[PDB]
Paper text:
MLLs degrade N-acyl-L-homoserine lactones (AHLs), molecules that are used in a microbial communication system called quorum sensing (QS) to coordinate a variety of behaviors, including virulence and biofilm formation. We provide the structural and biochemical analysis of the lactonase [name] (WP_017434252.1), isolated from the thermophilic bacteria [name]. [name] is a thermostable, highly proficient lactonase with broad substrate specificity (kcat/KM values range between 104 to 106 M–1 s–1) for substrates such as N-butyryl (C4) L-homoserine lactone (HSL) and N-decanoyl (C10)-HSL. The binuclear center, common to all MLLs, is coordinated by five histidine residues and two aspartic acid residues.
Asp122 is also conserved and is involved in coordinating the metal cation. To investigate the importance of these residues, we therefore substituted Tyr223 with phenylalanine and Asp122 with asparagine in [name], eliminating their role in acid catalysis, and kinetically characterized the resulting [name] variants. The alterations in [name] activity may still suggest that this residue is important, but the interpretation of this effect is complicated by the clear role of this residue in metal coordination. This could be seen through crystallization, where multiple conformations were captured: one where both metals are present at high occupancy, exhibiting an active site configuration very similar to that of the wild-type enzyme; and a second form where the active site shows no bound β-metal (or bound with very low occupancy). In the case of the Asp122Asn variant, the Asp mechanism is no longer accessible due to the mutation of Asp122, leaving only the terminal hydroxide or concerted mechanisms as potential options. Curiously, in this variant, the activation free energy for the terminal hydroxide mechanism increases substantially, leaving the concerted mechanism as the only energetically plausible pathway with calculated activation free energies within 3 kcal mol–1 of the experimental data. Visual examination of our EVB trajectories indicates that during our simulations, the substituted N122 side chain interacts with and stabilizes the terminal hydroxide ion at the Michaelis complex, contributing to higher calculated activation free energies through reactant state stabilization.
Residue numbers in the entry:
A (entry chain A): 9 to 283
B (entry chain C): 8 to 283
Amino acid sequence: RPKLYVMDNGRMRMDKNWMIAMHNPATIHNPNAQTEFVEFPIYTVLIDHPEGKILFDTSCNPNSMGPQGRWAESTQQMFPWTATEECYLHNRLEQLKVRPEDIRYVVASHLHLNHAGCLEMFTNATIIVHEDEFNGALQCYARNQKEGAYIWADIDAWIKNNLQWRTVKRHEDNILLAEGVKVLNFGSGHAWGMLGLHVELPETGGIILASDAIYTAESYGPPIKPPGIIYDSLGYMNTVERIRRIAQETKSQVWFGHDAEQFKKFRKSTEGYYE
Amino acid sequence: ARPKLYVMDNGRMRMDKNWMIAMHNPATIHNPNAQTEFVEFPIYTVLIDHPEGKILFDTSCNPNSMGPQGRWAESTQQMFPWTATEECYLHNRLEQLKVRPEDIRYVVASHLHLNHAGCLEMFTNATIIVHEDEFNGALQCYARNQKEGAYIWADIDAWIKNNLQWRTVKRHEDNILLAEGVKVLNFGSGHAWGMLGLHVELPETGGIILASDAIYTAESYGPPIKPPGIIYDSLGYMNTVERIRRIAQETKSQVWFGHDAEQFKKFRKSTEGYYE
Ligand SMILES: [Co+2]
Ligand SMILES: [Co+2]
């Protein structure tokens, strides 16, 4: 009988237009419309499963922010991450008496700065990632792109730590990872290659981890309100509607990438778990 | 074999620059409340007076678009205000060239947005060439009684009532040779559901590509490409821009953007002359 933990990995801020495109459009009466700098949670999920511990997303690297940080100053200033040491992934796991080395599977929803930050920790895991996302991030690396949402220093470490990669092929079916745990191949949308998770918990029932395939309940609607951070608009719309169908058909909850209200309600790792 | 191409000034529009250039000015830690700008841009149409028959690219906005009594919804008028003196109305521009709507053989609708398809209803004697996916999407807006957005219900109503003669460009259809040196380019989905361009080969001026809203401005075009906020198919949009770039390179054509203010300034308008 698995136990699922929600781990609080701090907070990030950014232009609300990244989150919800064209939220406050200029008008003839408000020609100089202003945006907001909204705050949202970064979190990860540990599924402690008989067949092996599964980790979904990894938040940000502890060495991300500041003048000796891995993130470019441009990135630090557009997407600032605020976190106490207790929020650091290694510490959240430590609190749960789980060692990095105990993780069998890490599912990378995508390789953005606030999701792939600590991949490098898990040298004993199989890292599951969409092949298109992997290819895209590696090109950023090879092209020496030191700005944007893909952190050169993070990728550098993934390679140096000799991580064990399992790429989900573009046209690959869902992957049964363990009893009641399936990796969903969302494909291109928010990013080059998005992965989700369906978890069937004996008590709680069905859970869909959407990650950045759906930022918030506002994104979800209906109607859908798409983000400014977006690669494949058609694929993004398709993915959201596909999630809506799966949720309906499997009677699952949809856990968004960073819904403040929803995260608030979650039972965090410090208080307990889901079963 | 020896045409005259005219650029017709059909007024100005204003809108949030974020529509034009996606996330042009993002907020940061030390500028959290970054503000946008209401940017003005030209609306124009192109008449190709060709021996085989007159060809019109785009139709601007309907004369009865703006105002309390206007066809455009309030919310639309506020976000996308059109300002035009009577001189700017397409029917007047054509008149000052001694061209009647009835003389137009073909209208090419780049797409069916408010500032491109506003005067389709005038050309009851023409074949209206439009992308089938754009036509389908617009008709759905109509049938769904959608009153707000960039597809004007009252305009579509008029197209149907005036019994326009339609020639849809199929999704996988090759370019169309409308006339000697005039090809309809099938750009497919991107900015909108179905985009059409034009390649014109003029004896003197050489090659011209009318991109319309496939490329808003030189800023859009880059490199680097800066996509718009008004977008349907991001991947298709990017594909189309790069395709236009290649065609321009290989055919040595100028690229005429949808609404580039600087380029528009440089144009010889219909009050001054034409391109041969
Ligand atoms: Co992301
Ligand atoms: Co348009």
